[PDB]
Amino acid sequence: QETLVRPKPLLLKLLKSVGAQKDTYTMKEVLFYLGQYIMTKRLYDEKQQHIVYCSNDLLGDLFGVPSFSVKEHRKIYTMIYRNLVVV
Ligand SMILES: COc1ccc(C2=N[C@@H](c3ccc(Cl)cc3)[C@@H](c3ccc(Cl)cc3)N2C(=O)N2CCNC(=O)C2)c(OC(C)C)c1
Numbered sequence: 001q002e003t004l005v006r007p008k009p010l011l012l013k014l015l016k017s018v019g020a021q022k023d024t025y026t027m028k029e030v031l032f033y034l035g036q037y038i039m040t041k042r043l044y045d046e047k048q049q050h051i052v053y054c055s056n057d058l059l060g061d062l063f064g065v066p067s068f069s070v071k072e073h074r075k076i077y078t079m080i081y082r083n084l085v086v087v
Pocket residue numbers: 031032034035036038039044048049050051052070071072073076077
């Protein structure tokens with residue numbers, strides 16, 4: 001009974017690029033897959049792994065900043081919610 005969401009096109013493209021196959025997800029699944037996108041594309045700092053640099057990537061278009069820490073929860077949840085609809 002978790003809320004189901006339907007990502008908008010750019011978010012869906014990111015999710016499918018890391019092997020998600022569906023069109024509707026829970027918020028925890030969206031977060032998991034975005035994390036995997038960062039990990040697979042090596043967008044994090046090797047020393048302080050919470051730090052992401054996304055300026056030269058579509059992820060930067062999603063979050064609207066060139067860099068962020070994964071501790072920026074308000075920004076991360078807000079930008080994900082701007083990029084989906086509830087089902
Ligand atoms: C010490 O290094 C860490 C510690 C925590 C995270 C993290 N933290 C998790 C997280 C972060 C923010 C929210 Cl709002 C929810 C979950 C989740 C995540 C989910 C979405 C995004 Cl956009 C980024 C990361 N997320 C992860 O995706 N992790 C967990 C740890 N290792 C991983 O391989 C993947 C982390 O993420 C990297 C991808 C940058 C690195």
